[PDB]
């Protein structure tokens, strides 16, 4: 079970951030299993962003619901999260992790650091 | 609707310490899906406890947990210098999931 | 698993029904039989067996029984008062629930009359509750028949989803339990039963040229004096013990 | 000495021909049926057994092909003149099925003999194949399969492949007593029909 | 030796309503002769169910019932706006017959 | 199968109330068939009063056994119930109904309202 993250590390204000998570060792199209994103800004705790389920049910943090969109490609084992209208304050390390019920997130990736400037 | 944690936890090596996390709302419902993480700076967060008290594979038996009411506790026995990490709690709410503030562990010596 | 308003049935026949494999599905929540003992299941051979599966709330599990009434019993899944079979149900929250609620499981709320045993209704036709036609317009006294459960991880016992399987047990039978067996003893003196052929005596090597379709042989007095071993297909010569 | 349903010795056997018209009537099924055929080009492929013989009641359909035999018990919308295309032109639709069985095929001219019985819900088939009106000589047929079909049979029909020539014979079994002789290997080598003549 | 009923029941048209009647004594014996009546103000009481679960003629198939132990239940399926009436239960005892307190049905809309 | 009721609607205290029920469409001389009386005071449930059978067997409510008398005349299809010592509190609608075993009362009449004053 492994998940690798890639994408832009530097984003300009008001632009859109797109991050892609590529996974292997498992299939996402199974009951009880989803893939979500979490971020951690400096000096702060982990913040939930978005979660996509095996059946393409898409859920988002209530404060970022209008800014986040999450989709998946089951043919390439990839999950993509886009965050619009990036602010100067939206600097954080983003993480891709597997979501289940008995365990909210596990198999966390190393994460990608994104700075807005 | 915020998970509350202590700023830090400390104690002598070889001894037992406790990291607590308390819910401040009824949105958590049964509050029976509490997860605990040990985050080592520069690395991914690791799951140490799930479903309140269960261990994942690849986790020492020194780590356990429990619940009382709407408050959860992580117990770390036989404290090692290698246990210095930022610990986080996580639980479900009515329409989302939350993480706690984070507790910084320090090993005395 | 299917929604309760649209329960899924499949026929079971021509098989060996090992009923022990279904006690390793989940901890244990609800299990009850009717006309049959749980410990005689791996024995009785049935003419027909049907498996009806669906997802409901834990508090609705009690409605799936003879003599019950409420909502599910009347509008979604009715069992007969003379139902024979065993019902199995367990907590499936960890697979079926969602953070904001799993809304893909539906049940019927609005219905003109009670259902017959093992009847189903898959219709989504608008229900008229009033004395006037709404012509499809969901206003006053006009409803969409179905409602969702919205199953969540934060729900307590009774509000969590349960997976329910009803095994209906019903002439020549085709669904039989498994048979037990022991080791074969040669050149001694034993009692024995070979695929239904009971007898006593000494079992030795045989030189009888049985045909491919023959299972046992007889002497000049029409008494069994040889059998074929049902597992090894070897022929055993049967004589009285000294 | 045994009493069972056997074809009486020296009885009348109905002889049907296949060609340019072929015989494909619906025949009665009484206590049991003896069926035999002689062919070179494999024209006879299967049989239909049942009562209403249509998508009105369940029926037993036995059809052979180059790799296996397919046996189905269903409510079939049988054709008015069902056949195989040398594709299936036996029925238009199967609406309700209860039983299915698959095995290796059941099928100088080739002589094939079959005995079809339906006892206490079990439909059982005996048969033999040898190289070659009916020939003289004696041979016992061995069992193929005894299926738990659980249906009634009053009539049956032979399924032919259309595109050669062939012929088939139909007899009926009676509850007579026969004296059977088993040789050293348990092969039935001879038999006496105890109701044929005063000598027997 | 009193038949006990709920004061009232309610729900929307098209929904199922259950009206219960429970014995409080053993005097009812077999309790196998339970009748249910529908009473409209200004009109004679009408028999809807008798002998626990049977219908009279002139009665909608929406009305049915059953028993469990010493308690009987009247089920009104496909609730109509015309079902607003006072429902009563009745049964035999050792030296008399009894009527229940009466349950008032209200249709919501 | 109908039953009609007639009699006094206003009775003075301590006097006797006499109500007559006339029925048609059936006989009361047949086995399993009787005629009984029930009353319903305002705000209260139905109360059993008296029952007479085809064989002239007469049964009464245990609390009113001493106050009620029931008789019948099979030549006129009439049943008469008399209630003595009428109390001011004995205000109710009285009903005549056919009595059977599998179903206690049916074919209820419209009823007669009796007030004591
Ligand atoms: C379901 O899977 C589990 C785990 O392999 C197995 O023990 C159980 O027997 C399976 N269920 C059935 C009916 O076989
Ligand atoms: C299963 O039965 C066959 C006989 O049909 C036998 O040859 C085979 O060895 C048996 N398998 C086992 C594991 O006993
Ligand atoms: C039928 O068999 C009888 C002998 O029992 C024979 O006399 C008769 O000719 C046969 N019929 C035909 C058409 O050959
Ligand atoms: C014979 O029938 C079976 C089942 O319908 C089919 O799978 C198989 O391909 C057929 N064989 C040939 C040669 O068509
Ligand atoms: C199909 O046939 C079976 C008998 O084998 C019968 O019990 C069943 O009701 C039939 N189903 C339909 C749809 O006719
Ligand atoms: C066969 O016919 C008998 C009447 O002789 C009937 O009782 C039986 O049910 C029938 N069986 C089937 C499968 O039709
Ligand atoms: C039995 O089979 C053998 C061949 O194995 C043959 O030689 C022998 O003649 C047969 N016995 C009889 C009576 O046919």
PDB file of C-alpha atoms in Angstrom, chain C residues 69-240:
ATOM      1  CA  UNK C  69     -46.104  -5.101  11.748  1.00  0.00           C
ATOM      2  CA  UNK C  70     -44.756  -1.532  11.571  1.00  0.00           C
ATOM      3  CA  UNK C  71     -43.251  -0.220   8.312  1.00  0.00           C
ATOM      4  CA  UNK C  72     -40.856  -2.683   6.736  1.00  0.00           C
ATOM      5  CA  UNK C  73     -43.078  -5.640   7.509  1.00  0.00           C
ATOM      6  CA  UNK C  74     -46.018  -3.968   5.768  1.00  0.00           C
ATOM      7  CA  UNK C  75     -44.615  -1.899   2.876  1.00  0.00           C
ATOM      8  CA  UNK C  76     -41.169  -3.317   2.044  1.00  0.00           C
ATOM      9  CA  UNK C  77     -40.620  -6.952   3.072  1.00  0.00           C
ATOM     10  CA  UNK C  78     -43.332  -9.192   4.518  1.00  0.00           C
ATOM     11  CA  UNK C  79     -42.827 -12.703   5.886  1.00  0.00           C
ATOM     12  CA  UNK C  80     -45.704 -15.238   6.155  1.00  0.00           C
ATOM     13  CA  UNK C  81     -47.051 -16.374   9.531  1.00  0.00           C
ATOM     14  CA  UNK C  82     -45.987 -19.924   8.664  1.00  0.00           C
ATOM     15  CA  UNK C  83     -42.498 -18.932   7.505  1.00  0.00           C
ATOM     16  CA  UNK C  84     -39.917 -21.686   7.726  1.00  0.00           C
ATOM     17  CA  UNK C  85     -36.233 -20.848   7.660  1.00  0.00           C
ATOM     18  CA  UNK C  86     -33.479 -18.905   9.459  1.00  0.00           C
ATOM     19  CA  UNK C  87     -32.788 -15.171   9.556  1.00  0.00           C
ATOM     20  CA  UNK C  88     -29.282 -13.720   9.854  1.00  0.00           C
ATOM     21  CA  UNK C  89     -28.407 -10.055  10.428  1.00  0.00           C
ATOM     22  CA  UNK C  90     -25.267  -8.128  11.344  1.00  0.00           C
ATOM     23  CA  UNK C  91     -23.890  -4.606  11.718  1.00  0.00           C
ATOM     24  CA  UNK C  92     -22.415  -3.300   8.460  1.00  0.00           C
ATOM     25  CA  UNK C  93     -21.693   0.305   9.486  1.00  0.00           C
ATOM     26  CA  UNK C  94     -17.979  -0.005   8.730  1.00  0.00           C
ATOM     27  CA  UNK C  95     -18.723  -0.734   5.058  1.00  0.00           C
ATOM     28  CA  UNK C  96     -22.004   1.044   4.313  1.00  0.00           C
ATOM     29  CA  UNK C  97     -21.951   4.288   6.326  1.00  0.00           C
ATOM     30  CA  UNK C  98     -20.686   7.660   5.077  1.00  0.00           C
ATOM     31  CA  UNK C  99     -19.575  10.824   6.844  1.00  0.00           C
ATOM     32  CA  UNK C 100     -22.486  12.917   5.542  1.00  0.00           C
ATOM     33  CA  UNK C 101     -24.762   9.886   5.322  1.00  0.00           C
ATOM     34  CA  UNK C 102     -25.273   7.091   2.803  1.00  0.00           C
ATOM     35  CA  UNK C 103     -28.383   8.118   0.873  1.00  0.00           C
ATOM     36  CA  UNK C 104     -28.344   5.262  -1.647  1.00  0.00           C
ATOM     37  CA  UNK C 105     -30.506   2.981   0.497  1.00  0.00           C
ATOM     38  CA  UNK C 106     -34.246   3.512   0.078  1.00  0.00           C
ATOM     39  CA  UNK C 107     -37.434   2.322   1.775  1.00  0.00           C
ATOM     40  CA  UNK C 108     -41.131   2.800   1.060  1.00  0.00           C
ATOM     41  CA  UNK C 109     -43.064   5.163   3.324  1.00  0.00           C
ATOM     42  CA  UNK C 110     -46.248   5.889   1.359  1.00  0.00           C
ATOM     43  CA  UNK C 111     -48.381   2.914   0.349  1.00  0.00           C
ATOM     44  CA  UNK C 112     -52.093   2.312  -0.339  1.00  0.00           C
ATOM     45  CA  UNK C 113     -52.216  -1.154   1.254  1.00  0.00           C
ATOM     46  CA  UNK C 114     -50.143  -3.807   3.028  1.00  0.00           C
ATOM     47  CA  UNK C 115     -48.040  -6.258   0.994  1.00  0.00           C
ATOM     48  CA  UNK C 116     -48.502 -10.015   0.767  1.00  0.00           C
ATOM     49  CA  UNK C 117     -45.713 -12.379   1.985  1.00  0.00           C
ATOM     50  CA  UNK C 118     -42.668 -12.238  -0.297  1.00  0.00           C
ATOM     51  CA  UNK C 119     -44.320  -9.556  -2.437  1.00  0.00           C
ATOM     52  CA  UNK C 120     -42.250  -6.684  -3.811  1.00  0.00           C
ATOM     53  CA  UNK C 121     -42.999  -3.295  -5.342  1.00  0.00           C
ATOM     54  CA  UNK C 122     -40.311  -1.545  -7.369  1.00  0.00           C
ATOM     55  CA  UNK C 123     -42.614   1.251  -8.609  1.00  0.00           C
ATOM     56  CA  UNK C 124     -41.791   4.927  -7.999  1.00  0.00           C
ATOM     57  CA  UNK C 125     -45.167   6.169  -9.235  1.00  0.00           C
ATOM     58  CA  UNK C 126     -46.481   9.258  -7.422  1.00  0.00           C
ATOM     59  CA  UNK C 127     -48.710   8.478  -4.472  1.00  0.00           C
ATOM     60  CA  UNK C 128     -51.938  10.423  -4.058  1.00  0.00           C
ATOM     61  CA  UNK C 129     -52.725  10.970  -0.407  1.00  0.00           C
ATOM     62  CA  UNK C 130     -55.533  13.497  -0.902  1.00  0.00           C
ATOM     63  CA  UNK C 131     -58.834  13.533  -2.799  1.00  0.00           C
ATOM     64  CA  UNK C 132     -57.417  15.396  -5.806  1.00  0.00           C
ATOM     65  CA  UNK C 133     -54.994  14.421  -8.639  1.00  0.00           C
ATOM     66  CA  UNK C 134     -51.668  16.321  -8.621  1.00  0.00           C
ATOM     67  CA  UNK C 135     -50.634  15.003 -12.044  1.00  0.00           C
ATOM     68  CA  UNK C 136     -47.015  14.508 -10.966  1.00  0.00           C
ATOM     69  CA  UNK C 137     -46.703  17.793  -9.024  1.00  0.00           C
ATOM     70  CA  UNK C 138     -45.297  17.114  -5.549  1.00  0.00           C
ATOM     71  CA  UNK C 139     -47.332  19.661  -3.574  1.00  0.00           C
ATOM     72  CA  UNK C 140     -50.062  19.034  -0.989  1.00  0.00           C
ATOM     73  CA  UNK C 141     -51.160  15.446  -0.282  1.00  0.00           C
ATOM     74  CA  UNK C 142     -48.824  14.239  -3.079  1.00  0.00           C
ATOM     75  CA  UNK C 143     -45.628  12.327  -2.304  1.00  0.00           C
ATOM     76  CA  UNK C 144     -42.627  10.427  -3.747  1.00  0.00           C
ATOM     77  CA  UNK C 145     -43.129   6.896  -2.200  1.00  0.00           C
ATOM     78  CA  UNK C 146     -39.527   6.332  -1.159  1.00  0.00           C
ATOM     79  CA  UNK C 147     -37.267   7.852   1.475  1.00  0.00           C
ATOM     80  CA  UNK C 148     -33.563   7.447   2.203  1.00  0.00           C
ATOM     81  CA  UNK C 149     -31.870   6.258   5.387  1.00  0.00           C
ATOM     82  CA  UNK C 150     -28.758   8.476   5.361  1.00  0.00           C
ATOM     83  CA  UNK C 151     -26.539   6.108   7.385  1.00  0.00           C
ATOM     84  CA  UNK C 152     -23.737   7.814   9.366  1.00  0.00           C
ATOM     85  CA  UNK C 153     -20.695   6.788  11.546  1.00  0.00           C
ATOM     86  CA  UNK C 154     -22.005   9.104  14.254  1.00  0.00           C
ATOM     87  CA  UNK C 155     -25.250   7.157  14.681  1.00  0.00           C
ATOM     88  CA  UNK C 156     -25.795   5.000  17.765  1.00  0.00           C
ATOM     89  CA  UNK C 157     -27.160   1.462  17.990  1.00  0.00           C
ATOM     90  CA  UNK C 158     -30.463   1.026  16.162  1.00  0.00           C
ATOM     91  CA  UNK C 159     -29.746   3.826  13.689  1.00  0.00           C
ATOM     92  CA  UNK C 160     -26.761   2.068  12.116  1.00  0.00           C
ATOM     93  CA  UNK C 161     -27.227  -0.067   8.940  1.00  0.00           C
ATOM     94  CA  UNK C 162     -27.637  -3.823   9.161  1.00  0.00           C
ATOM     95  CA  UNK C 163     -27.304  -6.420   6.429  1.00  0.00           C
ATOM     96  CA  UNK C 164     -30.143  -8.901   6.552  1.00  0.00           C
ATOM     97  CA  UNK C 165     -30.285 -12.301   4.889  1.00  0.00           C
ATOM     98  CA  UNK C 166     -33.356 -14.492   5.082  1.00  0.00           C
ATOM     99  CA  UNK C 167     -32.931 -18.153   4.191  1.00  0.00           C
ATOM    100  CA  UNK C 168     -36.258 -19.691   3.244  1.00  0.00           C
ATOM    101  CA  UNK C 169     -36.265 -23.453   3.676  1.00  0.00           C
ATOM    102  CA  UNK C 170     -38.722 -25.568   1.702  1.00  0.00           C
ATOM    103  CA  UNK C 171     -40.490 -34.032  -2.856  1.00  0.00           C
ATOM    104  CA  UNK C 172     -36.961 -34.909  -4.136  1.00  0.00           C
ATOM    105  CA  UNK C 173     -34.488 -32.699  -2.296  1.00  0.00           C
ATOM    106  CA  UNK C 174     -31.455 -31.008  -3.828  1.00  0.00           C
ATOM    107  CA  UNK C 175     -29.912 -28.891  -1.052  1.00  0.00           C
ATOM    108  CA  UNK C 176     -28.311 -31.369   1.378  1.00  0.00           C
ATOM    109  CA  UNK C 177     -25.986 -30.987   4.345  1.00  0.00           C
ATOM    110  CA  UNK C 178     -22.384 -32.327   4.348  1.00  0.00           C
ATOM    111  CA  UNK C 179     -21.469 -35.843   5.467  1.00  0.00           C
ATOM    112  CA  UNK C 180     -18.708 -36.832   7.879  1.00  0.00           C
ATOM    113  CA  UNK C 181     -16.345 -39.764   7.427  1.00  0.00           C
ATOM    114  CA  UNK C 182     -13.433 -41.637   9.010  1.00  0.00           C
ATOM    115  CA  UNK C 183     -10.364 -43.608   7.928  1.00  0.00           C
ATOM    116  CA  UNK C 184     -10.603 -46.934   6.126  1.00  0.00           C
ATOM    117  CA  UNK C 185      -9.430 -50.042   7.988  1.00  0.00           C
ATOM    118  CA  UNK C 186      -8.307 -53.140   6.088  1.00  0.00           C
ATOM    119  CA  UNK C 187      -7.604 -56.758   7.073  1.00  0.00           C
ATOM    120  CA  UNK C 188      -8.997 -56.481  10.604  1.00  0.00           C
ATOM    121  CA  UNK C 189     -12.761 -56.898  11.421  1.00  0.00           C
ATOM    122  CA  UNK C 190     -14.981 -53.842  11.691  1.00  0.00           C
ATOM    123  CA  UNK C 191     -18.503 -52.541  11.500  1.00  0.00           C
ATOM    124  CA  UNK C 192     -18.982 -50.302   8.479  1.00  0.00           C
ATOM    125  CA  UNK C 193     -21.197 -48.019   6.403  1.00  0.00           C
ATOM    126  CA  UNK C 194     -20.233 -47.347   2.777  1.00  0.00           C
ATOM    127  CA  UNK C 195     -22.322 -44.577   1.203  1.00  0.00           C
ATOM    128  CA  UNK C 196     -25.440 -46.059   2.805  1.00  0.00           C
ATOM    129  CA  UNK C 197     -24.473 -49.740   2.575  1.00  0.00           C
ATOM    130  CA  UNK C 198     -24.404 -50.885   6.205  1.00  0.00           C
ATOM    131  CA  UNK C 199     -22.916 -54.164   7.352  1.00  0.00           C
ATOM    132  CA  UNK C 200     -20.249 -55.908   9.398  1.00  0.00           C
ATOM    133  CA  UNK C 201     -17.219 -58.090   8.714  1.00  0.00           C
ATOM    134  CA  UNK C 202     -13.659 -58.080   7.411  1.00  0.00           C
ATOM    135  CA  UNK C 203     -12.657 -55.794   4.551  1.00  0.00           C
ATOM    136  CA  UNK C 204      -9.919 -57.198   2.300  1.00  0.00           C
ATOM    137  CA  UNK C 205      -8.445 -56.668  -1.159  1.00  0.00           C
ATOM    138  CA  UNK C 206     -10.799 -57.670  -3.963  1.00  0.00           C
ATOM    139  CA  UNK C 207     -10.233 -59.102  -7.442  1.00  0.00           C
ATOM    140  CA  UNK C 208     -13.831 -58.591  -8.582  1.00  0.00           C
ATOM    141  CA  UNK C 209     -14.044 -57.021 -12.032  1.00  0.00           C
ATOM    142  CA  UNK C 210     -16.684 -54.376 -11.357  1.00  0.00           C
ATOM    143  CA  UNK C 211     -18.071 -52.348 -14.234  1.00  0.00           C
ATOM    144  CA  UNK C 212     -17.493 -48.521 -14.206  1.00  0.00           C
ATOM    145  CA  UNK C 213     -21.083 -47.919 -13.063  1.00  0.00           C
ATOM    146  CA  UNK C 214     -21.332 -50.593 -10.355  1.00  0.00           C
ATOM    147  CA  UNK C 215     -21.087 -49.701  -6.667  1.00  0.00           C
ATOM    148  CA  UNK C 216     -21.456 -53.051  -4.895  1.00  0.00           C
ATOM    149  CA  UNK C 217     -21.827 -56.760  -5.625  1.00  0.00           C
ATOM    150  CA  UNK C 218     -23.777 -59.763  -4.355  1.00  0.00           C
ATOM    151  CA  UNK C 219     -23.356 -63.525  -3.921  1.00  0.00           C
ATOM    152  CA  UNK C 220     -25.556 -66.377  -5.198  1.00  0.00           C
ATOM    153  CA  UNK C 221     -28.070 -65.707  -2.411  1.00  0.00           C
ATOM    154  CA  UNK C 222     -28.389 -62.052  -3.388  1.00  0.00           C
ATOM    155  CA  UNK C 223     -26.481 -60.930  -0.288  1.00  0.00           C
ATOM    156  CA  UNK C 224     -23.918 -58.127  -0.473  1.00  0.00           C
ATOM    157  CA  UNK C 225     -20.368 -59.478  -0.493  1.00  0.00           C
ATOM    158  CA  UNK C 226     -18.452 -56.520  -1.901  1.00  0.00           C
ATOM    159  CA  UNK C 227     -18.593 -52.734  -1.866  1.00  0.00           C
ATOM    160  CA  UNK C 228     -16.865 -49.864  -3.627  1.00  0.00           C
ATOM    161  CA  UNK C 229     -15.208 -47.303  -1.383  1.00  0.00           C
ATOM    162  CA  UNK C 230     -16.869 -43.960  -2.301  1.00  0.00           C
ATOM    163  CA  UNK C 231     -13.650 -41.965  -1.931  1.00  0.00           C
ATOM    164  CA  UNK C 232     -10.907 -44.236  -3.252  1.00  0.00           C
ATOM    165  CA  UNK C 233     -13.180 -46.185  -5.620  1.00  0.00           C
ATOM    166  CA  UNK C 234     -11.416 -49.381  -4.529  1.00  0.00           C
ATOM    167  CA  UNK C 235     -13.285 -52.661  -4.199  1.00  0.00           C
ATOM    168  CA  UNK C 236     -13.441 -54.236  -0.760  1.00  0.00           C
ATOM    169  CA  UNK C 237     -14.157 -57.936  -0.391  1.00  0.00           C
ATOM    170  CA  UNK C 238     -16.493 -58.567   2.531  1.00  0.00           C
ATOM    171  CA  UNK C 239     -16.394 -61.792   4.510  1.00  0.00           C
ATOM    172  CA  UNK C 240     -17.670 -62.692   8.007  1.00  0.00           C
TER     173      UNK C 240
END
